[PDB]
Design a protein around this ligand. Structure first.
Ligand SMILES: NCc1csc2ccc(Br)cc12
Ligand SMILES: [Ca+2]
Ligand SMILES: [Cl-]
Length: 223
């Protein structure tokens, strides 16, 4: 996250870190057994780390649980990033408590102008590289479809939205991928892509979670 703030330990209790020897992506706990992330975060050998604040120090509220199954969306295209969503099932159920909690799925799509919270352990510089150990947060609005399209001609599908600031300075970044965009208490986006980070006229692009709720629920119901 570029231009954000330190969230505070365990104040984003649905935020998980995906670890394969090191943190490589975020995700969102949606029930005791299942995490939402980006399909471009897929790999084998994932350990899900719940209850994290400093990802390099054991602080006392973590739960580490290995994935049993990853399901990439049926229509994910890794060239266009259309349908950039996957589900990860945990080998054992998480202990839910005030610091490890699931985030509700939307019941309708959110509108442009709605405020959201974007969070992760990604790069904090727009030029340059610096990775934080504690979780960072950014409050940012969803941008209109028309400004998103004009920012990225030929690249925004109906399964994507933009959020952030056309002026630049405040955005998600490499290492935030797969993490949450929560708006009015619902998971509306997944950190997906952009062109650099926090550049003028290049806002972040996010998977549009409201399009996937019936695939998410039916997948969970049979897996
Ligand atoms: N918002 C931009 C963005 C999101 S994930 C990611 C990975 C690499 C880079 Br560079 C930018 C990004
Ligand atoms: Ca920790
Ligand atoms: Cl792309």
């Amino acid at each position: 996250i570029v231009g954000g703030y330190t969230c505070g330990a365990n104040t984003v209790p649905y935020q998980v870190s995906l670890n394969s020897g090191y943190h490589f992506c975020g995700g969102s706990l949606i029930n005791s057994q299942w995490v939402v992330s980006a399909a471009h975060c897929y790999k084998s050998g994932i350990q899900v780390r719940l209850g994290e604040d400093n990802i390099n120090v054991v602080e006392g509220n973590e739960q580490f649980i290995s994935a049993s199954k990853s399901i990439v969306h049926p229509s994910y295209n890794s060239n266009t990033l259309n349908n950039d969503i996957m589900l990860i099932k945990l080998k054992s159920a998480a202990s839910l408590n005030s610091r490890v909690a699931s985030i509700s799925l939307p019941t309708s799509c959110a509108s442009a102008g709605t405020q959201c919270l974007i969070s992760g352990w990604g790069n904090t510089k727009s030029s340059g590289t610096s990775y934080p150990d504690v979780l960072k947060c950014l409050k940012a609005p969803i941008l209109s479809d028309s400004s998103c399209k004009s920012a990225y001609p030929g690249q925004i599908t109906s399964n994507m939205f933009c959020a952030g600031y056309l002026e630049g300075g405040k955005d998600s970044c490499q290492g935030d991928s797969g993490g949450p965009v929560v708006c009015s208490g619902k998971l509306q986006g997944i950190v997906s892509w952009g062109s650099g980070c926090a550049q003028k006229n290049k806002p972040g692009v996010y998977t549009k979670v409201c399009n996937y709720v019936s695939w998410i629920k039916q997948t969970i119901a049979s897996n």
